[PDB]
Write a protein that binds this ligand. Structure first.
Ligand code: HEM
Ligand code: HEM
Ligand SMILES: Cc1cc(N)nc(CCc2cc(CCN)cc(F)c2F)c1
Ligand SMILES: Cc1cc(N)nc(CCc2cc(CCN)cc(F)c2F)c1
Ligand SMILES: Cc1cc(N)nc(CCc2cc(CCN)cc(F)c2F)c1
Ligand SMILES: C[C@H](O)[C@H](O)[C@H]1CNc2nc(N)[nH]c(=O)c2N1
Ligand SMILES: C[C@H](O)[C@H](O)[C@H]1CNc2nc(N)[nH]c(=O)c2N1
Ligand SMILES: [Zn+2]
Lengths: 409, 413
């Protein structure tokens, strides 16, 4: 009734008891494992989700079953009778937001989990208010380059008709344009959203790295376009410490990764607009953003200027060019004093974290498929780490795109 | 009953119906996924356990040859059923043996090489009775499979398990491996992965040359008896010296690797029968050597030396000095194997072939069990197509399974 996991590089073994607290499906069964699938209330249903979280919280402050505690257990249960839902105390919102990050199985950055700055935006009511909260988030988090992790939490879902949503998948993305001759300008992953913003009245500059506008939806109304003041959008020009022609590539990338399309679930409530931001692992930019074939796809471009044998795959010209690109990302950010972590430091930090979590908490849900970096996998320590994956609450979940689901006016 | 998988690089979606035939545990539950665990958690079948397993294997063999429900199919079932009832086991026809072996390979969810599953040379060694006999069967396998560098997939199959007390085992984990010697001071000579098995060999009288690339003796076990030592004849062990197309100094490293990878510690399960000794071999993907064998810290661990020779700034990690030297190593391995006309496949060619295979298998067979954590190569993962491919993992039989290390199990005399 316990589970061990081994590190085959170190032969260290850890015992998992924390898993005895999951409930949502993994999607796997004893007959099929779905570890690589990207995606596998009423009166009744809300009470116990709230109940278990309050017990969770009060257990986290020594005072489990305390004289206080039951008054909150009382008050929360009382409020659900009247408003149907209920509202978290500031204490609960901060705990719940920090623990959703703590339980994000796919996040390698979680050693930093309790150093989360929470911004309570639950008094927001209009897209204009949303824009204001988001601008203050970006400015705080960017912090001239000394980035700090933060989340802004907008009002919880109530009936579905009046959701608050950030339609951008991230606060800061570059735009994607369909070129008349079948090709794509900018970031290909963003063609659809970019066409919506254009359809919505955005006047695109139609270059590669055009920062998309914010498309914010408050209280179920139609979304509205807002352009983020550029003085808040910190960007880095990508140069190489060896190749002088590298600056000639015209490459830049922004400094603030901020996820804005996910759903945060605390005690049964559903915060559908909860943008959060950290700082980059270099491979996110170098390997995935620049080198996916469905993204900026610069491998051919870089190897050409490196003059590499591009005919046979066994020359490993893609591998060589990949390493160089990621050297330039990490070097460009460090030269411009913008926070960045390479995949070796990042993965070394996550082994520490797993060690911490097993000692003080008894388990750390982790998704090997996402924690292992997209490059040089086995030379990082997480590659040889067995992990158990299980779903703990509070949690970040996916949700449908608003445009697939929104009935306009 | 109609599970979907998506490729996130191409948007292709495939429909899996084959999963309905799955069986033994994945190791996962609705509450915990174990897809990154390496393993799970007198033991021989009864007449009652065996009847169903055999029937279903026979039913599926006869379905494969478009003879399901035929009189041949019906007599075979009755022949098997009676044999299990009288002898508490049964013997596969040779045709069934070959189909079973090929389909355990087809079914092997961790194998990226499966596009070759049906071109497999099966050697029926079920008439073997002694360790000397095994040595001979293995020598023939090595020579056939090596083929002067034009490698050829093969398996040799020794007698099936009876009561567990009389098993055939190849105590080696692979038929060709380099010895590893721990030292007084904690350093290791050779291959640190093989320190234990080397010590066993030495205990059994093997006189070790104590070198960085010593081919281990074979340690063969017939019919539950004590294992016995045999030296593979060196002329049958094809090796490749590792050099680099650009760095003249790379040969000064003194690297070499053997050409033939051949797994000899697994168990082949066909129709409820267990062939505890079934060495099988193919050809290498370069990353197996150039990433895992040479660059794992618990292995030969040469990144340090190679970076040095490349004059790499190794002060910080964010120089990516390990990444940079790992690439030039794997370039050298591909270049060496190719230079000497020894069959090898790079990780990009191999993953592209496997996507092609996996699609054809959905189309023609209705699914293709795959283990993402093992299919993705341990370098440059996301620039290979398997990284963006959703995969369903389930156990199809016939199958290769892990089994305990024999030295942990065997009782001596
Ligand atoms: C502080 C620096 C951080 C780093 C270096 C980091 C690193 C990463 C990386 C590399 C991924 C993979 C993302 C992808 O491939 O698209 C990821 C996923 C994730 N991170 Fe972090 N992270 C950080 C902070 C945070 C914070 C502050 C939160 C929430 C408050 C968070 C929650 C998540 C979640 C929920 C995912 C899953 C994404 C998904 O399912 O698509 N992370 N993280
Ligand atoms: C023909 C060329 C082949 C190639 C290129 C190939 C490739 C691979 C690779 C790269 C692995 C991962 C191994 C590791 O990281 O330790 C693997 C695993 C495996 N292969 Fe293949 N293989 C080939 C032939 C075969 C054959 C002939 C069989 C059986 C008849 C087979 C059955 C397996 C099995 C059972 C595993 C799982 C190993 C384990 O879980 O320890 N393969 N293969
Ligand atoms: C909090 C956080 C930190 C970090 N270090 N990374 C992320 C993911 C960010 C991200 C992902 C994707 C692709 C998601 N499939 C595109 C982006 F523009 C983006 F910012 C989030
Ligand atoms: C048939 C086959 C083909 C291939 N291409 N690869 C393999 C795995 C072979 C192998 C694995 C390990 C590590 C096992 N823990 C060490 C070896 F020396 C070795 F040959 C098997
Ligand atoms: C998915 C799966 C495939 C297979 N053939 N057999 C099993 C049974 C138990 C088992 C064996 C192995 C080693 C053989 N792959 C790895 C596992 F994760 C595992 F659960 C499971
Ligand atoms: C813990 C983890 O499951 C382990 O390191 C696995 C990961 N993936 C692998 N993939 C392959 N091909 N070979 C391996 O040995 C491993 N090891
Ligand atoms: C198919 C596969 O599950 C999918 O491509 C996953 C694999 N691992 C990943 N890991 C990270 N960090 N990010 C990703 O987008 C993915 N994609
Ligand atoms: Zn699973």
């Amino acid at each position: 009734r316990f589970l061990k996991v081994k590190n085959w590089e170190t032969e260290v073994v850890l015992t998992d008891t924390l898993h005895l607290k999951s409930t949502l499906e993994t999607g796997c069964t004893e007959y099929i494992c779905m570890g690589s699938i990207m995606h596998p209330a009423t009166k009744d249903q809300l009470f116990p989700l709230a109940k278990e979280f309050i017990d969770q919280y009060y257990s986290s402050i020594k005072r489990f079953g305390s004289k206080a505690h039951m008054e909150r257990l009382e008050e929360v249960n009382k409020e659900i009778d009247t408003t149907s839902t209920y509202q978290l105390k500031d204490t609960e919102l901060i705990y719940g937001a920090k623990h959703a990050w703590r339980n994000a199985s796919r996040c390698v950055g979680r050693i930093q989990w309790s150093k989360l700055q929470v911004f309570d935006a639950r008094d927001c009511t209009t897209a204009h208010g949303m824009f204001n909260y988001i601008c203050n988030h970006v400015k705080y988090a960017t912090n001239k380059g000394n980035l700090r992790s933060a989340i802004t939490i907008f009002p919880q879902r109530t009936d579905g008709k009046h959701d608050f949503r950030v339609w951008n998948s991230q606060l800061i993305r570059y735009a994607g344009y369909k070129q008349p001759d079948g090709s794509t300008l900018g970031d290909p992953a963003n063609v659809q959203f970019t066409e919506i913003c254009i359809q919505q009245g955005w006047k695109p500059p139609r270059g590669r790295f055009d920062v998309l506008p914010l498309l914010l939806q408050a209280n179920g109304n139609d979304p509205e376009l807002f352009q983020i003041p550029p003085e808040l959008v910190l960007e880095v020009p990508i140069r190489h410490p060896k190749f002088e022609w590298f600056k000639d590539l015209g490459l830049k990338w922004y400094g603030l990764p901020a996820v804005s399309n996910m759903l945060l679930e605390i005690g049964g409530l559903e915060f559908s607009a909860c943008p959060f931001s950290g700082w980059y692992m270099g491979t996110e930019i170098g390997v995935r953003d620049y080198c996916d074939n469905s993204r900026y796809n610069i491998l051919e471009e870089v190897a050409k200027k490196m003059n590499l044998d591009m005919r046979k795959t066994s020359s490993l010209w893609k591998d060589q060019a990949l390493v160089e690109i990621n050297i330039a990302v990490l070097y460009s950010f460090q030269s411009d004093k913008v926070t960045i972590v390479d995949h070796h430091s990042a993965t070394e930090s996550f082994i520490k974290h797993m060690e911490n979590e097993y000692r003080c908490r008894g388990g750390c849900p982790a998704d090997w498929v996402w924690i292992v970096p997209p490059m040089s996998g086995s030379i990082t320590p997480v590659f040889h780490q067995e992990m158990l994956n299980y779903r703990l609450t509070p949690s970040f979940e996916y949700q449908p795109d608003p445009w697939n689901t929104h009935v306009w006016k």
